[PDB]
Design a protein around this ligand. Sequence first.
Ligand code: H24
Ligand code: H24
Lengths: 389, 390
Amino acid sequence: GSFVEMVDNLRGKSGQGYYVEMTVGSPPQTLNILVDTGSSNFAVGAAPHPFLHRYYQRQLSSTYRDLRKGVYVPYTQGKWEGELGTDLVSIPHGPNVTVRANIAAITESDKFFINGSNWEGILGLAYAEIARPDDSLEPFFDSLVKQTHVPNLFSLQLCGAGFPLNQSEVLASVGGSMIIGGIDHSLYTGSLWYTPIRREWYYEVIIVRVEINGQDLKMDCKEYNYDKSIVDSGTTNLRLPKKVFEAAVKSIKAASSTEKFPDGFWLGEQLVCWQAGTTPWNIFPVISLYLMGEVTNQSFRITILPQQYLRPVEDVATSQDDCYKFAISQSSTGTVMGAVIMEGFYVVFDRARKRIGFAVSACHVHDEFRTAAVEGPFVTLDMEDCGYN
Amino acid sequence: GSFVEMVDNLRGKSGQGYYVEMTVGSPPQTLNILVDTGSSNFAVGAAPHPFLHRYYQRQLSSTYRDLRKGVYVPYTQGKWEGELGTDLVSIPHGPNVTVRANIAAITESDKFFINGSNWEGILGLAYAEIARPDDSLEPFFDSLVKQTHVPNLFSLQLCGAGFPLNQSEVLASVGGSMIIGGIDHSLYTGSLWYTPIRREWYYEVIIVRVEINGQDLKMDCKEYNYDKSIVDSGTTNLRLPKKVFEAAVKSIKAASSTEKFPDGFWLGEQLVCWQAGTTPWNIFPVISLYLMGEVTNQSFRITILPQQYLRPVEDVATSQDDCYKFAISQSSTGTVMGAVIMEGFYVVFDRARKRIGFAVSACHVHDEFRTAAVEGPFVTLDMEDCGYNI
Ligand SMILES: COc1cccc(-c2cccc([C@]3(C)CC(=O)N(C)C(N)=N3)c2)c1
Ligand SMILES: COc1cccc(-c2cccc([C@]3(C)CC(=O)N(C)C(N)=N3)c2)c1
C-alpha cells in the first residue's frame, strides 16, 4: 500500500511535461524521460541538439544491440526520426530491476524537443497497437512486465504547483510520483473510482455526460467521444472535439460573464493577469466529466476547478501579478484528458484489469470554498452508445 | 538583344565561379573577376600567390589613391586581408564608362584563391550594409550608378554546360552574360516574374512554398527563410536551412527510390556515375520554389530540374561515364539560391525597383521531356509571415 522508493520521483510541469530519471546502456547513461501515456515508443535523443545537454551515446554502451531499422514519426509541421535498437534500461527511483528494452535513438527532430523542459527522451506508456513503425515493436512497459515480476499496473500523481516555477525552481521542485507496479494510498484521498479501458491502443475511455457548474452541456454523448477520448499525460490541455469545445466555451463564458476577456484568451493564446492573490476563482465554473463505470448502467464523475483549467504562467514583465492561460483547447482527434486534468487526480492505469482509476489527488490546487472531486455512482443508460465507431 | 557588347562576357562554372574581365588602374591592368551577388567588396589579388598568374600592381598605376586603412575579411572557409584604396575601373565587355571605385588590394589570403578558377578578384554586387569594414565603403555598383548614366539594374545569365569542362575547354567556353544597366531579351524565353527584394543588404527574398514533383514539402513557410533566403551567384549549391534540407532530402530520396545512392552522395561529398548518356534524369524529381509576388496575396514559382541540382564532375578515372555531385546542401545561415539554381534562369537584379526577376534561361540544360519553368500567378495568403524576424 506504500512505495516510498517511488514517491516524489517526478519533476516538471503541465506546459513542458513531467519526467522521470532513467538509465540506458552499460555503463549506465542517465537521462530525464517524459512520462507519456499518449504514445507507445521509448525514444531518446541520440545526437547533439541545441536543447539537449546530454543524449544517448550508443557507441559507449557495451550492451547496445542495433536492430538495423529506421523509424519515422511525423506530426503536423514537425517530427522525430531515429534508429531502432535494444539496450539494458533501469529506473533509479523505480522497481529494482533492469530490463532489455527497445530504444529508438533519435537522430533528427523538428519542433520535438522543448527548450528548458529538462527531458531528453520520451517513455511511451500506451499499447503496442500505436507503436511505430508498427505493433511488433514491444513497448517498454510490456517488456518490463514480461521480464520481471512487476505487476501490470502503474499510477501517476502529477502535481501542478498552482503558480509559475522559474528555471531553478522547476529543477528543484518535486513534480509528482509515478508508482510502477502499484498504488500508494498516501497520494490520494477518498475512494478510487474505475472506468473501463474501452480498447487497448491509447488509454481510451468513454465520457457519458458533461456539466459546467452542474448545468448539462446536453449534447449527444457520442459528440464527447468523437472520434475517441483518451487519458494523455503527454498533452498539456483538456482538448475537446470542435463541437464540444464550442459549446463548452460558450457555457464557461456565460458562467464567468461578470468579467470579459479578449478572444485571444479563449483561444488559449494570450494570458490573463490579476493583482497578486486576487484571481477571481469563484467567477469561473467547475467542470464535471462523467465516465462510464464498471457496473452496468452506472457512471461516476470527476470535477475540475478553474485552478486546474487555468494554467499558471509567468507574466512578460515578471511582475508580481498572478497570470494564466486558458488550458482548454479544440481538437480534431477526439477528447484528450491532458496534464491539467490529471493534476487534479491520482490516476491508476490498471492494465491488468483493463481499467483506469481516479481519486482526488493529495496534491491538487484548490481554494477554501471548492475542491476537485471524484463521486458516484449515478444511474446512466445506453453508455455503450456514447462510444464512437 | 539590346546589349550585344555585354552578351557572352562571362566564363567559368558553378563549382569555381563565373567571372568577368575588368581593368584597374592607369595604364589599365586586366584581371578576371568573380561575379558575386553574395558580397559587397571589390577586392583583387595585389601580391604574389601560388594560384594567381597576375595581380594588381598599385605602384604601376598613376591613378592609384591609398585610403591608408586595412581590411580583414574571414569567411567560413578562407579569409583575406587587404589595403584599401581607389582607382579607375572599367569593364571591357561592359558599359563604355570608367569609374573611380574602392578597391581592396589583397596582400594576404588563406584558402581564398581557387587553383584553376582563372579569377584574380571578386566583384561584390550586393549592398553597402554588408560591405567590409563597414557600410561607408561604397560598393562598385553604387559608384558606377552615381558617376555615370548607367541604369540602377544588372541581369545575370549563368550558363552551366551540362557536362564537365576540362581546363582548356573552360577557358575557351562562353559561361554566360552579365548585362550592366539592362535586360537582354535574347537571354530568356517566356515571361519575367518578379519577387520583392525584402531588404537591401544581401539580395534577400521570401520563399512561400516548396514542392518536390508537385508534392508540398508542407513546412511552416518561416522555416524556408530561417534566418534569411538570398540569391548568391558566389555560392555553388542550392543551400537549405537544416530542417528544410532534411525534409527535402527525404522527399528527393522517396521520389528517386527506384535507385539507391550511398549516404556520401546525399552529403554532396561523393560522385555518382552512369554509363555515357544513361543518366536517369526521369527518376529524379523537379523542385519548385514559390516566391512572394509583387501583387498582394500572389506568388509565382521557379522550377528546377535534376540537370540543375546534379552538378557535372569529371570521374576520378576520367572514364567515359557521366558523373555528378548532389548540389543541394545544408546551411546554418538560411537559404542560398546559388549558381546551380541561377543556371536554370535569367536573373534580373532590379535595384531601382527593389525587385528580382526570374525567367527561363535560353541556356538552361534540360531533356526532351522536361524543362525548367517560371510560372504564375498563384493565390498565396499571409506571405509576410514567411519572412524571419530576429
Ligand atoms: C505535458 O506533456 C507535454 C508538454 C509539452 C510537450 C510534450 C510533448 C513534446 C513532444 C512530443 C510529445 C508526444 C510524443 C507527441 C504528442 O504530440 N503528444 C500529444 C504526446 N502525448 N506525446 C509530447 C508533452
Ligand atoms: C559559384 O561561385 C563560386 C564558386 C566557388 C567559390 C566561390 C568563392 C570563393 C571565395 C570567396 C567567395 C565569396 C567572396 C565568400 C563566400 O563564402 N561566398 C559564399 C560568396 N558569395 N563569395 C566565393 C564562388
